[PDB]
Amino acid sequence: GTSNRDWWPNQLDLSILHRHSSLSDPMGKDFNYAQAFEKLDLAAVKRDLHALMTTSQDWWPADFGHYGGLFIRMAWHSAGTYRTADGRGGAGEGQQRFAPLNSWPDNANLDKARRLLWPIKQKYGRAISWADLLILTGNVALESMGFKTFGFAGGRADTWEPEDVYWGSEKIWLELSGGPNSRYSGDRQLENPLAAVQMGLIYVNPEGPDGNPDPVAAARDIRDTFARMAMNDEETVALIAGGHTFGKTHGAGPASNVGAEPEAAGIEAQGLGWKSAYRTGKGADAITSGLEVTWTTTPTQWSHNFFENLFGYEWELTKSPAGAHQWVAKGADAVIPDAFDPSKKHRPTMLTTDLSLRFDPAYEKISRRFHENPEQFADAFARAWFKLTHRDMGPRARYLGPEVPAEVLLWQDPIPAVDHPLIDAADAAELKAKVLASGLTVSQLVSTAWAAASTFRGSDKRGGANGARIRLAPQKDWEANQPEQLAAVLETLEAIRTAFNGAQRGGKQVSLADLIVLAGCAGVEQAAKNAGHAVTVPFAPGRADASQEQTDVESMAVLEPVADGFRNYLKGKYRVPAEVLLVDKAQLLTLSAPEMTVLLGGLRVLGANVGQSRHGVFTAREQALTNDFFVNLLDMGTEWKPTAADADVFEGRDRATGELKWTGTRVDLVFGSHSQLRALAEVYGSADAQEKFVRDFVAVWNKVMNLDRFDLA
Amino acid sequence: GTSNRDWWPNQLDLSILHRHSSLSDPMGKDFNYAQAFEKLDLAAVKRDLHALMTTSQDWWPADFGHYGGLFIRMAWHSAGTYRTADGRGGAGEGQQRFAPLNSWPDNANLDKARRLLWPIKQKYGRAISWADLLILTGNVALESMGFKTFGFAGGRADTWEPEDVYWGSEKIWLELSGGPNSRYSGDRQLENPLAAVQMGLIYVNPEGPDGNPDPVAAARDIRDTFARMAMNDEETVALIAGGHTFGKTHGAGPASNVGAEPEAAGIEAQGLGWKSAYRTGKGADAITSGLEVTWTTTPTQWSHNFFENLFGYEWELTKSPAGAHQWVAKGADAVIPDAFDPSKKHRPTMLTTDLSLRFDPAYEKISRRFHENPEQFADAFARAWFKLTHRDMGPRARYLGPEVPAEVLLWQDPIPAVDHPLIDAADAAELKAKVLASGLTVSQLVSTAWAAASTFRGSDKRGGANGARIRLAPQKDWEANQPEQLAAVLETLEAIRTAFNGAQRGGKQVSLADLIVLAGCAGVEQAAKNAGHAVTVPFAPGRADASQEQTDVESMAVLEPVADGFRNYLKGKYRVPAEVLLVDKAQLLTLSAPEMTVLLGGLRVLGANVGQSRHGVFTAREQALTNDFFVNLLDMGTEWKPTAADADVFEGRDRATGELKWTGTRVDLVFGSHSQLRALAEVYGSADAQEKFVRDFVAVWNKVMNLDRFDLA
């Protein structure tokens, strides 16, 4: 059936803002996963997972009698889709069980791993999500094999449909770089926001870059991709060597034996895929990646044998039975056990990417240290494993259950505990009046609070106004935040704060984080009043102020908004049209299309644009909260044309006189062009809509102010 | 950006079940359009519409100084997408303003007509939907030009995103038949559910079939398409001749002058399209279809000149200025006025499809009768216009406002007014006990109520249990309804009814319609009791029994469920896979995926399958309401394979012994295959879900029983 996507393949797609509706959700509207999980008998679940590790099923026999390696790989791929650039991917929503990730080539046979878990999932039901189970199972695997984890948090709620993620533009799975949809340009520059070298891989090609078995070159891809998943060199080495302490790869026969991935398989395969015509098709004959490497002499026990082997032998380039490049230890004895035949042993083997850990000079140093001091290796790996598997979970307030580690880690963007009474409704009305009496304008107040709150992204639950990190490096210096103007607003607000806090009893005080948001609330209330409306903007206190020392400046760089359509801002020129960047930002803020529409139309007339740009400011009463954006945008008496100077800026002229009335960007005019957005703009641009516009604006403003408020969940 | 649709273009699409969520809706949850409309000052709206008719805008000047003809076309296209096969299309959701219909070639320049209405839409706001406005405008245009309409009903609620409709498989706009995705096969057989001859046309090609200007052959397409939009020969003739009493076509210059349709146009076009480089691009130079025909001597007034011209001249084949085939009156004077230049007149002209009304023999007779008896033409056209523009509105109880015609028409599937007291809760308990004491089984009770209620479709709001039409021709004879078994259940229910009604006082009685539904409710209660649960199923009385004479047997044929996955029924072999037909049926029933899932798993174990097929009956306690379907479907101890005899039937065997445990169809197994459906099945197949299964099943059962209950809405 031909679809709108077929006819108009470059039209903006709004359906990403309307996923995860209550329609698609099988749980009741009141279902609260955290409360279900808090009553889970986690210990009982872990005992069952422990038994499962050594209970082989005949439909996918356990290598060495132990599923531990398979489940570690399962949990590392669940987490390993994560990208720091947008926060999308990762383990936090259990997306491995949906398309496309369930059918990526790098996820081959993890369908088997998930199916082995069904009996436990079924036993415990809604009290443990798939998302949480995947990770837990990886932890229990590590534990069953002698490795002490750093901890575990539950609370990843299950999702019920595929997430909309840009994974690349290639039309061919695993396409080598340099094709018509190359993810690479320049000197091997991987396009943002991607974090894998080929479509359908987690990070890198285990044979080497585009299949070239050079460990030195492979190290460069490893460092790049892993950095793009928020891991530095120490973490990266700890993770790869840690992981490859266990289990094995599967390449027993030619890859052409392997059938359709799960989304393409026949209905009778019942959600499984990669059915193999090679011999028994499983167990000793398994084919997964096409490589056939077993790293250690005890694949089902934690050890330091990965680095003993890596450094203790010289390595020779060879081929697996499927024809993949891989490496074998020169002159070695047959010391590695066979996965199924107790009478066979094999020589030590490695992947090209394993050898990177020795032949890249910076890795080599860390690898040597870990070799010489395997207790440091153990600790770095435990920490990296926790980070990897929790990096997208958000603030510590979301962490559930009895195994949460008490140590606070810098990567968590931590927020200190609140240890004093909070302001009440009377205090909030007093602080709003002081803020307005200071002479800060509607536009400054709205802009500052917008800047603080709108760093939130729902993809990994980073950012937001909690912490008052806007006052710290690097936020205070981002161009979108107008550093000079921001500093003056913050200095006035801090004097207000100091005077309020100095006047209190019983330890009551207000944080700057809370006051920045509250002051924005006063902006919006005043703007409403300037328009003849009496409204109270809701406000919830309880934010706390983080220090500079609790704020990793490099990790915060990925939250910089290089595009923010809500402030009509684009830092440079990109290949993605600005309206597409608007919808992307809306999705990260968890907004629907109506919310995005209302929000943007309001922000325009409040003066939230960066640099005081008049683009899209379609009102003659700036700083009054009215629906003027929509009434004026939709006025057919105005005709619009791209300017000579800039095709992305448009002049709106009176159709009869030619007089210049307004200017706007693509982000402004999309609301009068796109047929679905214009239908929304019509609702708010109607003569009966001013009260609705004000109410809906205040609601979405409050929603944005609270996005990171998991302490109130 | 490569999507799941790109990777797996034949995968079932569930997102059609989760369209129109509260996420995409700009109105509050509680917005009730009927109530807004009932307060609209309709008289004031119609005054404003009357003024608009002759208020020419320079950006799209009015032909002859009067937009009436353009607005009639605009309303007839709004309505004219309707297909009787599925009820999809029509005017009832205002979908002309969304993709793809906003940009179909047959809808060219109706973007201008809709933009002309914006100031009125804006003025009256949510109190009049676009959907209602487009139709009302067509009525007002007719009225402004001297034609008395049969009436008007409001109540078409606006929608906020494109409807999911199969419009064809062609990848080229207007593709002629016989291409790789031909909608035609055999002796010009149009595939169901399509009701147009080319992709992007309303009904037929105005030049003739595939562009061949044979009026007789064109008549065959007109009769077939129009029958597929629920119109017979008399209605068809009255509509085409009525419509083409007004206005003109637009073909002043070559079509290559005309640019991008709205969805492809630049952002500066602000939602409009087909911008033309021919001369002024509008008014006297307008190009819309490429034809250049003005039918009557008074294009802005109702007249009887269409048929005078059609029969009064002989016609000669010629070409418009754009090169299109069209007809000119042999030897005629220049009597037709020019749309802009008072000093020009033109000869009478016609389309090939107009000439069909004279050269098809069956049409010719109607056309003559209308020519000789103009009052019959007038009345037939008024009636057919009301029908065309209300055919997808559903039962009369949804009709709003002061112009609703009092006459009840056969095509409305009318239901008599209730004129007696209704049964109360005591009476319902008494009737349920009688139904259970009669010996009717759970399977009979459920199957019959399912059969009665599940004819509803939300596309045009036809069908459902009201009316008790299951007891009449043709429903009583449909194979999916099991005529013999249905008759025995109905006869028992009717004796129950007779004895209950014979015992009452005042005039209380129960309808058969109500008793069929109630009896189904008792079945579900009994099934629940068979499983150890104490459940009361909600029931709302007030359905009435329609007569045979109130039930058009031909128009009812399109509600026959040739595919009903809920009863594991497929009447023949189709080119669409059965799981796709299941999702299609669920959409028409207004079900979400979780609802479809729960519903189907329950029906299977209650014995609702046609013919007592054991396919999907995965339980050893049939007629007990349990989640066995899910627990057994997801049991990995069973392996499935398509049978040798039939690739659409699967055998589920013990993995260890090879013993046969079950059989199933594609509809059954899809719930264990598709990754989103399987996620849903997991919820209901978990150990904690038997109570949630039972309660969600009752809720969705009740929902289906009430789909048509607009008397309670």
Ligand code: HEM
């Ligand atoms: C440069 C990074 C990495 C590459 C190229 C890589 C590559 C691979 C490949 C190709 C396989 C074999 C799949 C098969 O045929 O079954 C595999 C297995 C495995 N990897 Fe990795 N990997 C990397 C990092 C990691 C990390 C970070 C972890 C976990 C901390 C991990 C844990 C595992 C485990 C446990 C297995 C064994 C699976 C089994 O026993 O079935 N790997 N790896």
Ligand code: HEM
């Ligand atoms: C065989 C069925 C029909 C065919 C092929 C057909 C075809 C067309 C075409 C090609 C145009 C010219 C479009 C343009 O260039 O502007 C048109 C105009 C129009 N049609 Fe039809 N028509 C059909 C039936 C109807 C019906 C059922 C109605 C209304 C009851 C209707 C009312 C009109 C009106 C009022 C116009 C004039 C538009 C204007 O003045 O701007 N037609 N028709």
Ligand code: NA
């Ligand atoms: Na994420």
Ligand code: NA
């Ligand atoms: Na419809």
